[PDB]
Nucleic acid binder design. Structure first.
Lengths: 147, 147, 147, 147
DNA sequence: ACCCTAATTCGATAGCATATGCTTCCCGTTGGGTAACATATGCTATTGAATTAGGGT
DNA sequence: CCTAATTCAATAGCATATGTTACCCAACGGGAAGCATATGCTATCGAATTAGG
């Protein structure tokens, strides 16, 4: 099983698994009734989603793609190693670890938080590896010019 | 031309090209007597570097890695589309553009502003398409826990 | 497949279904680091749980049974009818509907709202009837003297 | 003596016995003209009545029901045990007792505190074991949507 | 000032190794609905033992 | 230092409620196979600025 299915990349569809991960989201983000698009449309906020595993982090993005068509989604990449313990030479800035990450772009400082707090709670119940997905809020000082 | 040169993802060495990029950044940053590492070792601020062209981004990433042994770098990744002008359907959240980005994790917020400038400045000196690269500072409200 | 199992009322045990439903409660509960018992041991608080279905309420009482040993739990009963629509005589104050409900007794008003918000979040991500379960906070003005 | 009498749960009717209780209430609260209803028909407050004995609680539920067609009454059901005196092993949460309780749902927060005092004095005048019934006022921060 | 002709710069490129996106089968987990035995309550009318009223002294 | 009347709780008993388990099985959601295609990496090549008797 598996192979090519005629829809390339950045062009993912809708599957019963995701739309439940999405519905589970677009119920937790309900609790707060905040704005999602600004009159200006500039991307000044964002949510940074990482950890767990690549399968978990993917399905979560795939659901978030459905729960929030008012946002824009990077594909999953990887993270640089941290700061190594002990006082030796540190790992080389460019170095790659196996943990993935993706980014959620948004137009709103406020509803960034609403998503960060919903993802933290959607994840928190599930059994591993979903429990290990982590979320922080990032806000871009100068806005980001998505094409 | 081309082939396997034994160096895997994130283990790129330095060659007179990339340390030449990195020596430009170091002269902009040897004016700046700021501290680059905290003791809690937490990664709170980011420089989001994007646009330009895959390769000059790739080169700039590669110089930044030699100038700044205190940063951490993602790999290159793609941006998704912004809003669409005029009318019609909007882009899908997931839909991805030809435009690239990487990120530069850092331990202090004072050094992100500094490094956003050096990069904005250093790239304005180099010929096109390099100089169309854009830089915006992140702040992670909770911090990024790099592995 | 049915029958007697030597477990009277208010004397139920533990099995891997309730233990994971209580796992997912603890998680939503850890978010606030608030105290759960005082030195008077007065029962001054409460969480009134109801709706959804009898089975789904039971699995949630059974779960909160494990997740919170500092509380005490009533068995399930049924709710009386509300206000009939229109201006005819209302339903008899004694006549009961099929909704069930249970209660949780607690020693601090603060931890009561942590469990209100913990149950409300736990459930809304789940598919029916678990998400029709509803939660309000109680506070007994003179305390309740459990035997 | 005994047996089936056609009447299912919550469908219990008037007889000269209970209307002697209901008219004791209707004389303690008669010359307190406060308003028992609202137009929103929201069930914000309760009066928790418990202790006493299984049957003399049963009569008072049945009295309270004729006196007040503005209230709603649960059926009877049991209380869990309280704190055992001394750091000996504690009763389980689900632990249940020989003591019973019912609740009185109400639409106003004033009439709640009226009906607590009417009951607390309607019980003052009847012989033991009745006089040991404990009445406490209850409030629902989010209210109870009765079916 | 002019200007055609050297070095000089980086970006663009080829090409191996290996990423992710996309989906379809897989399958352990999560979690509600049910059967079936001991035992709760709701319901009535009848029965029992206190507290209460009566009227002799 | 008083025996008839009174007041309610306690009762028997049918029909039915949940407490409890173990069994069933629909779904929720992570992991892997497998094609197109993206990057990391290097050294080499090419097309733009910058330069001198």
């Amino acid at each position: 099983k598996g192979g090519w299915f005629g829809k390339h990349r950045g062009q993912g569809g809708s599957n019963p698994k995701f739309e439940n991960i999405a519905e589970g989201l677009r119920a937790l983000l309900a609790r707060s009734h905040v704005e999602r698009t600004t009159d200006e449309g500039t991307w000044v906020a964002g949510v940074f989603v990482y950890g767990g595993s690549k399968t978990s982090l993917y399905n979560l993005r795939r659901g978030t793609a459905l729960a929030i068509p008012q946002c824009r989604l990077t594909p999953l990449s990887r993270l640089p190693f941290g700061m190594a313990p002990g006082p030796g030479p540190q790992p080389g800035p460019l170095r790659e670890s196996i943990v993935c990450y993706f980014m959620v772009f948004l137009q709103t400082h406020i509803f960034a938080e609403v998503l960060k707090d919903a993802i933290k709670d959607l994840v928190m119940t599930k059994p591993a590896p979903t429990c290990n997905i982590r979320v922080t809020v990032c806000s871009f000082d100068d806005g980001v010019d998505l094409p």
